[PDB]
Structures are given as structure tokens and as C-alpha cells.
A and B are shown apart, each in its own frame.
Chain A
Amino acid sequence: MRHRKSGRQLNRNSSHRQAMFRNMAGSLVRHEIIKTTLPKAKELRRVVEPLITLAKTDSVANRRLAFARTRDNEIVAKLFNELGPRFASRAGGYTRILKCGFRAGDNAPMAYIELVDRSE
């Protein structure tokens, strides 16, 4: 009955569920905007937001924990140097969810989950 439980199952096993966000967060960190399923977007906030707040204060310990997650060097390089110190003033809620029609193949709600930035 899942009273007060949290964490969408997303029709996948424990491994795949964890593994897809690791790959999905990488896409969000690298391109600053993606287009995914609406429920998948809402769950991505629970994973990215920590990884950004984790990247506030650059250190030796943090660059390993941000590597323990996301398992990549370009993500840790983009963070802590460009993305990380950029959110100095803002406290939480770095991302933004915006609904966009439906997927034209299975009728699934789409969403552009982007960061409050992109002023290049």
C-alpha cells in the first residue's frame, strides 16, 4: 500500500533503475537539457540536485564521491569547475521541469528537464 514511501519503481529492477539515472544524469550534466519521460524527469531531481549540492565545495573527498556516482571524468571535470561554483547564490532547486506534449509512438508525457542557466 506504500504509505509514506518514496522512489518511483519505473518498471525496472533495482540495478537498471540505479544504472539509468547514472547514465541520464550524465546527459543532463553534459548538455544542460534533455528530453525524457515525465515520471523519469521528476525522479531525476532526486539524483542530480544532490550531485550539484555535492559539487558546491570542491575538495579531494568530494571529487571521489562525485565519481563514485556518475562514474565519469568529464562529468566531474564539468562539475566543480564550471557548473559547481556557478550556483553560488542559489540554494537548492537548481533544475526545472517543463511539460511538452506526448511521445508520438506510445503516448507518453514528455518533459524538458533543464537547469536554470544556459545563458551562453
Chain B
Amino acid sequence: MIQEQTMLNVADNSGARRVMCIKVLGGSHRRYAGVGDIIKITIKEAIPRGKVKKGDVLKAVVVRTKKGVRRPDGSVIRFDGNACVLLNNNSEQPIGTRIFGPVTRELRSEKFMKIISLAPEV
């Protein structure tokens, strides 16, 4: 459950380390983000050598939440600490070549094939 002003943990080594969601995309008057929705975020802190630095405003997609995604039977795969994978504005295509931590099967939507095919688990 990610609404605005939520601090996240950067899953990819694009350069960011701590980001904040400025607005949930995918509909009007939307409450919060979730599973694998697209969100427009800002970076609150980046590493000195990353591709991106502090102050940028670009898209992202959640991969791990503490709210947890629900399997079709009643199983949840809750995690510890919210995460996201950075993406370019116009092109979905992520920025980080490596992904730290697991992702979930619900993220598979062909545009995130690049992401799941760069996952260390699940």
C-alpha cells in the first residue's frame, strides 16, 4: 500500500538508494499503489557514481511491499521494507542492470519481462 510521500528502498543499482513517490499513476483520484503498478517518483538520495542523482523525477514500479500481494488462494508474500525498480519516463525499460532481492510472479506483464529476467529470486 503505497500512497504519496512514501519512502522506498531502491531495488536496482541504477544509482538511487532512497526514493519517494510523488504521485500514484494508473487512474483518477487513486488511493494507493500496489502489486506492480507504475508510479512517478523523485529520488531523495542517490550514490555519488550512479546513472541518476538526487532531484530527478522519473517513473518506477513497485516490486516489494510490506502490505504484500495476494495469491489466488489466500496466500500473501509480505516482505520487509517497500521496494521499487526505476524506469525511464517515455520508455518503460528499466535503468538498473542488477536487481537486489526477490520480485513476485504478479509483476509479469511483458513490459516487465526485462525485470523478472533480471531477478535473483522468484
Direct A–B contact in complex, judged by CB atoms less than 8 Å apart:
no
